[PDB]
Each structure stands twice: as C-alpha cells, then as structure tokens.
Design a protein around this ligand. Structure first.
Ligand SMILES: [Zn+2]
Ligand SMILES: [Zn+2]
Ligand SMILES: [Zn+2]
Ligand SMILES: [Zn+2]
Lengths: 152, 152
C-alpha cells in the first residue's frame, strides 16, 4: 500500500478544480516518487486553455515534469482524477509508471483501466466523491466539449 | 485511402529530415483526409527542440492539426516514419483514426503495433529505406538521447 495516496489525490483534485475555474475540462493529476513522496509535477487538461488536442490531464502532468531519464518513472505513482483513456493509459505503459491511483471511474472508463492491469500495472480506484461531483457537472453542462475530449 | 500513401510518407519523411536538421529525433508524421488527400497537419518529435516529454512525432502531428470534432478523425490516415510506442498507439485508438501507415519497424517497435490490429485498426508497414537510414544514423550517433525518448 501507499502512504502518499491522500496527498496525491488532493493535489490531482486541486488541479482539476483549477482547470474548471479556467474554463477547461475538470481533470487533473500529479506524478509522485513513491519512496520519498516528492512531487515530480502536476497538471490538468489544456484542451481549451491552449487549443490542444493532446494535453489531457495525464499528458499535461507528464509534460510538466519535463524531460526525465527513463529510470525516474519506474518507482512513481500517477494520480488522476478520472480513469484514463487509451492514450493516457499508453503514456503510463510506455514510461513504465508502475502504479496508477484513480479518483473515480463512474463518469468515465475505457479499456485502459483493465489493460493497465493486464500489462502488469497496479490500479487503485478510490471512488472520491469530490472528483465524481465536478466531472459529472462538466459533463452535464458541456457534453459536446466533453465528447470532443474523448474523440466522440 | 491507399492512393495517398506515397504522399503521406513523403511528408512524414520530410518532417523527420527537418527535425533531424534541427538537432532533434528524426521521427515525423502527418494526418491526411482519406477523402481528398488534404493534409490536416504534419509534425516531428520536439523533445530536444522544446524540452518536451510528450511530443513524439505522432503526438506532435496531432497537436499541429488543432482541435477537431471527433468525427473528423474517423476517416483519416496517420503516417509515421516509425512504428508507434504504446502512448502514440493509444492516441490513435482514442481518436478512432482507422489507418496507420508506418515507415519502418526495424529500428523500433512496441506491443502497440499489434494492439492496434486487435482493437480493429488497419496497420501498414512500408519498410521505407529513407526512414530506416536517418533513424539508424540517429541511434548510432546519440543512443542515450534515443533511449530517453522511449523512457528507457
Ligand atoms: Zn482522460
Ligand atoms: Zn487521456
Ligand atoms: Zn515513437
Ligand atoms: Zn510514441
């Protein structure tokens, strides 16, 4: 188990709330070193902020950590407020991030959640009410923008 | 769709060469509309040019296409000079881009190449010598730089 999960999810939610305030998709996250709990980086979806088709919450988080030597990712945990799509799932796998803690998978979920476990990654779903509340609201008020974010 | 394959790879290779000239990783791409052969966008890896951990040739290409309605990707072809990693593979899957034409899978390949087929996509490996030559030259000269790109 990990002692940094509360810290990790609070930060990810903090990013999601910020993104929502800026008028974008309420999905945030952060990357943490499991051994000491240091924050390698944090971020949120930037589709609307930067007119970006690739900056999902998880991707923005990884971009914010900057260029890193492959070994650095090997003992970290990626925290995301929502279960990852196939692209973000791919990012986790490609870099070898061993653990993914998910805020919730009620508002959204792809084959990536199971694929992660099939590829040997540990996935933890906390079922956080805050995350579920803000994401459901966005989906309700701006469904068209939501679908654009998941290619639908 | 196949009729634009020579054009698509030409552009993808031009992007790779340009990126190489810029001192970066020689991997390029472009997304073409299967209907009229129009180029929605083209790009190359920007790791060195912008200190980016997510802008692989494929991701950069999609970013350069700009925000698009989910339906637009459903009938396009993504050309990449090199077989996609799990992240870029995931991007193709999430957006529903039906075809992925690859320059070569000799210098590199991931489980994504096949996963794309399992997920219902069409994969075509042309074995382009221009692509293989410039990529092998890069790996030979700057191996550490290459490994960083694939998180190793
Ligand atoms: Zn997502
Ligand atoms: Zn995603
Ligand atoms: Zn690649
Ligand atoms: Zn890639």
């Amino acid at each position: 188990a990990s002692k940094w999960d509360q810290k990790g999810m609070d930060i990810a939610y903090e990013e999601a709330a910020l993104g929502y305030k800026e008028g974008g998709v309420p999905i945030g996250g952060c990357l943490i070193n499991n051994k000491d709990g240091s924050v390698l980086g944090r971020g949120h979806n930037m589709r609307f902020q930067k007119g970006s088709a690739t900056l999902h919450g998880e991707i923005s988080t990884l971009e914010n950590c900057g260029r890193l030597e492959g070994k650095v990712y090997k003992d970290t945990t990626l925290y995301t407020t929502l279960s990852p799509c196939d692209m973000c799932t791919g990012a986790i796998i490609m870099y070898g991030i061993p653990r993914c803690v998910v805020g919730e998978n009620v508002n959204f979920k792809s084959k990536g959640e199971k694929y992660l476990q099939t590829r040997g990654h540990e996935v933890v779903v906390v079922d956080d009410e805050r995350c579920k509340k803000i994401m459901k609201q966005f989906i309700d008020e701006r469904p068209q923008d939501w679908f654009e974010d998941i290619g639908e």
